Amino acid sequence: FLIDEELLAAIDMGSNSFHLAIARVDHGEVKKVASMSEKVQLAAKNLTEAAQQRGLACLARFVGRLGSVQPNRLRIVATNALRQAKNGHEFIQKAAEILPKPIEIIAGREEARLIYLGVSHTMANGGRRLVVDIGGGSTEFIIGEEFEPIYTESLQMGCVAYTKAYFADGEITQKAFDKAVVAARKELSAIATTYKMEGWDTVVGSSGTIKACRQIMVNMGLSDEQENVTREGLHKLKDKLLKFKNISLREDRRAVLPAGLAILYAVFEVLEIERLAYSDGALREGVMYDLLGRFKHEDIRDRSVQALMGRYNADPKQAERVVNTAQYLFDSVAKPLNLTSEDSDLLRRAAYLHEIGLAISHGGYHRHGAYLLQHSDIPGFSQIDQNHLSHLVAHHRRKLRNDVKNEVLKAGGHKLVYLSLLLRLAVLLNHSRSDQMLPAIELTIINDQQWQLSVSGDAKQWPLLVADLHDEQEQFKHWNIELNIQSEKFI
Amino acid sequence: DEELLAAIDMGSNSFHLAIARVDHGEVKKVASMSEKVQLAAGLDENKNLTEAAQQRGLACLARFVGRLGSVQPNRLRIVATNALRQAKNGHEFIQKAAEILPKPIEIIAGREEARLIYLGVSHTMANGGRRLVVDIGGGSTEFIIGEEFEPIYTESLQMGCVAYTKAYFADGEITQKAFDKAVVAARKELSAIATTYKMEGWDTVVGSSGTIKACRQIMVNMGLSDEQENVTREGLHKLKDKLLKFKNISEIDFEGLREDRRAVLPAGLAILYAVFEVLEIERLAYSDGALREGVMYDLLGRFKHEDIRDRSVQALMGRYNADPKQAERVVNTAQYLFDSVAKPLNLTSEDSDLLRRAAYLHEIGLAISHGGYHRHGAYLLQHSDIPGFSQIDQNHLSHLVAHHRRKLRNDVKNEVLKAGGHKLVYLSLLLRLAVLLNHSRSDQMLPAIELTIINQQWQLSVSGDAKQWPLLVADLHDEQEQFKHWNIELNIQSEKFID
C-alpha cells in the first residue's frame, strides 16, 4: 500500500526456476533491495498442472512483496517456455488474475540485446566484447562496445533441442557429438565471417550451460587462473565426456550437457575464441537497466520509434498533429475508460508510426504498417508490445468488422479496442493533414458503450468532417459502440 | 522492322495503339489508333466483366495485332489499367487474350500508371518548370507533380467519368442535386492528397484525357476558354451553369460535343470542377500525350540500357540497407549458373534480368527482421509501388526472393507455376544455388569448378581445394532434398573436391 516511486522490480520466469529482484534508483544507479528465487520447473508441449499452480502461487507471493512498486516500474518476463505450451495462453490468463502487469515473452534479437546490456553494466571491462549465451532453445551472440551493441544475433541451437534431436535417449556417442557440432557449425556459418572480421578484445558468456561448463572446468582443474574457459580445457572435457556411455555437476544439468558441450565447442572452434568469462546477471539485469531508462525518461522503445519513422520517412508534422489530438482525446476519456500511463505511451507510439506503410504503398498502408510493426526487430519492444502496436495501426482506417474486434479483445482486451478507436478518431480529424487551426472543439465524453463527440466552429471551413464522423458511427457500431455527434454548434 | 516500336493501352473507355520507329536520335510516329471498347461499362455489380465486353476487347486486340506483324515482340508492351485492376474475372480475359497477343497483358498499378502518363505528357509539352498533370479516366484519376521528365509526386484516385455516371447520372438526368453529390464525392477523394499536393505547388497545369479533351473543345467553341485555348476556371463555372440549365443528357446542345460523350460529360464535368476548386487551379492546358506515349518512352529507356527498373532496384537496396558486397557476389554467381543452363532451359535475357534484380534484392528483408527475411522481402517486393514494375513483374520478383532460402514444398511450386510457369521455377532454383554458394559471405574464390548441367534432373559438379569450403558439400546434399520437394533430382558430384 505504501508506494515508493524510485522502486523497480522485475520478475523472470525461467525453465526450472523463477526470480524476483527489487531495487531502487540512487543517483541514477540501481541499488539492490531484494532478491527471491523460487524453483517451479514448470517448463521441464502443454504445461501440466503439476507445476502450474506452483507458479501461480510463487507469483502471488511475489506480487505481495511487490505491493510498493508502481506498475510503470514493474516488468514480467519469460522465455523458451510458454512459447512451447498449448495452454500457455491459459497460464498467462491465470497469471493475469495474479500479476498486475501482463507476462512478456522476450526472445531472439531482443533477448540478445538484454543479455549484453546486463553483461555490460555488470562486468565493466572496456573494449569490443563478444557475449555468448546458450539458452534452451537458442544461443545469443552479441558484439558491442560500452552499453551499445553493434551486432545482435540469435541462432536457433539451444541445448534442449540439440539433445532432443541428437542426444535423445541420453546415450553418449562419438558420432552424436560430431553430428551435434556439425549442426552448430552450420548455424554459425551465417554470422562467423561478419562476427570474426568485426573482432573482439574480450569474450564473456552467460546462461546455465556456460555456468555448468565453467564449474566442471574448476572442479576438474581444467580452468585458468581467472576461471576463463579455454579451448584446451574445453577440448579435453569433450574427450572425457565421450568416454561415458550414457548420461547416468548437477543432476538436472547432465541431461542436456552433451548438447551444450558441443555447442560451445563448436562456437569456440568456428569463432576461434581462446578465453571466455562468465556473467550470472544474464538478461535479468538487462530488464532492470531497461527499467532504469524508463525511470530516467530515456526509454529505448521511444528511441526505436523515432528510428522507424526515419527509415520510412513518415511525415513528422502529421505525426505531431495526430499524437497531440490523441492525447487530448485520451485525457478527455482517461478517468471513465480507466486507461493507464502505459496506454498513453502505446497510443503515442502508434500515432507516431501510423503512416509508415506509406513507404510501401499508398493503398492499404495501414495493413502494411501493421505487417512491419508485427514482424520487425524493434529494440525495446517485446512480442506482446509489438503486437499491440501493430493492432492500433492495423485498424486506424477502412472498415471495422466485429470478427476482428474479437481478435483485438483476445490480444489486449477492451483497452486495446478503446485505443484503436481513439486512434481512429485522431487520424480522422487530421485527415486534412496541414491545417490552419483546430476545425472544432472536438470534445469527447463517454457513458457506457456510447460515446459523445461535440463539434463546434465554422462548418463552412472543414465541411467533410460531418460526413466523415457519420461514416465513423457505422464503423463504431460494428465494434459495439454508439458514437453520437453533436454538430449543432458546427455551422 | 527491327527499329519499330509498339504499345497497346487497354483503358477503361478505349483501347489505344501506337507504333513508332527510332531513326538515329529521333523517334518518328508510324501509327496511332483508338477503338471504343468500353471495358469499364462491361463491369457487373459483382465487378465482373460481361462476355460482351470481353469480346469487344478481344475483337479490338485482334485488329491491333493485325497491324503489328512487323514489330519485334521484344519491342512491344501491352498494359492494362483500372478496369482490369477491378475486374474479378480479369484473369479469364487475359488468358483469352494470350491466344491472340504476341506478349502478355500487364496490369499496372495506379501509381505506375500516373508515372507513365507523366512521361507521355512531358515529352509533348516540353517546358521547363514544375507541372501538375491531371488525367480523368473512366475509372480513376491520376495526379502527378513533376519537373522535366521526372515525377516528384504521383497519385491515383478512384474517381472517373463512367463510375460517376453510374452512381449519380445513370438515368441521364442532369439535376443540381446529382451534380453536387458528384462534386462532394470527388472532394472527398481529393481530400486525401489536397494540402500535400498544394504545398508542393506548380507553375503549370496540363490535362490529358477524353474528359479534358472534350471540355477544352466545347469551351473554345462556346468562347469560354482563352487566348492559349486553355480550360480556365471561369469557363468551367459558366459551362457548369449552362449544363445545369438542361434537365436530361439528351438535350445538351454544346457545340463540339460528340454523341458518345454526352452521357459521361456531366460526371466528367463534376470531377474536373472539383479538381479545379480543391487544388485552386486557374488555367489548364491539354496535351495529346498519355499512357500510350509513356509506354513508348519507358521502352526507349530499356532499349538504351536505361531501365528505370534498375534504378528502382538500387533505390530499394538503399532503403533496406542491403549489403552491396553480398549482393554482387550472388549476382555474379547467379549469372554464372544462368549462362551454364540458359540454352537447355530456353531462358532469355529477360529471365536473366529478373534473376539479376532478385539477386540484388534477396536480403532487403533483413531490414525488417533477421528471422524469415526472405518472406519479409517477398512482402515488400509484392506490395510496394516500385517505378517501372508492372504487377506481373513484381510478383515474379517476389517469388524469386520468397523461395530462395528455406524448406521447399510442392504446393508452393504449383503457386509458382501459376505465377510464371516453369521458367519462374528454374529461376527460383538458380537463385537458391547462388545464395547457397555464397552463404558464408567469404569474398574468396569459389571452388573453381562449379559446372551446372541439365539432363527434370540437374547435375552440380564441384572440384578444387575443399579447405576453404568445409561445409559446401553438406549444404549441397541438404539442397538436394529441397530440390526433390519441387520434383527435381539434383545430382552432386564432388569426387575431385578434396583437401
Residue numbers in the entry:
A (entry chain A): 4 to 47, 53 to 256, 263 to 505
B (entry chain B): 7 to 461, 463 to 506
Show the paper's wording:
Degradation of polyP into phosphate is involved in phosphorus cycling, and exopolyphosphatase (PPX) is the key enzyme for polyP degradation in bacteria. The PPX hydrolyzes and releases the Pi progressively from the linear polyP chain.
While the KpPPX and AbPPX crystallized as a symmetric dimer, the DrPPX crystallographic structure exhibited an asymmetric homodimer. The AtPPX has a ɑ‐linker consisting of 9 amino acids (Gly298‐Ser306), the KpPPX and HpPPX have ɑ‐linkers of 12 amino acids (Ala296 – Gly307, Gly285‐Leu296, respectively), the EcPPX and AbPPX have ɑ‐linkers of 15 amino acids (Ala296 – Lys310), while the DrPPX has a ɑ‐linker of 20 amino acids (Ala300 – Ala319). The shorter α‐linker (AtPPX, KpPPX, and HpPPX) enabled the C‐terminal domain 3 to interact with domain 2 of the N‐terminal, while the longer α‐linkers (DrPPX, EcPPX, and AbPPX) facilitated the interaction of C‐terminal domain 3 with domain 1 and led to a relatively loose dimer formation. It was observed that PPXs with similar lengths of α‐linkers presented similar types of dimers: the KpPPX, AtPPX, and HpPPX (9–12 AA in α‐linker) showed a compact dimer configuration, while the EcPPX and AbPPX (15 AA in α‐linker) displayed a relatively loose dimeric arrangement.
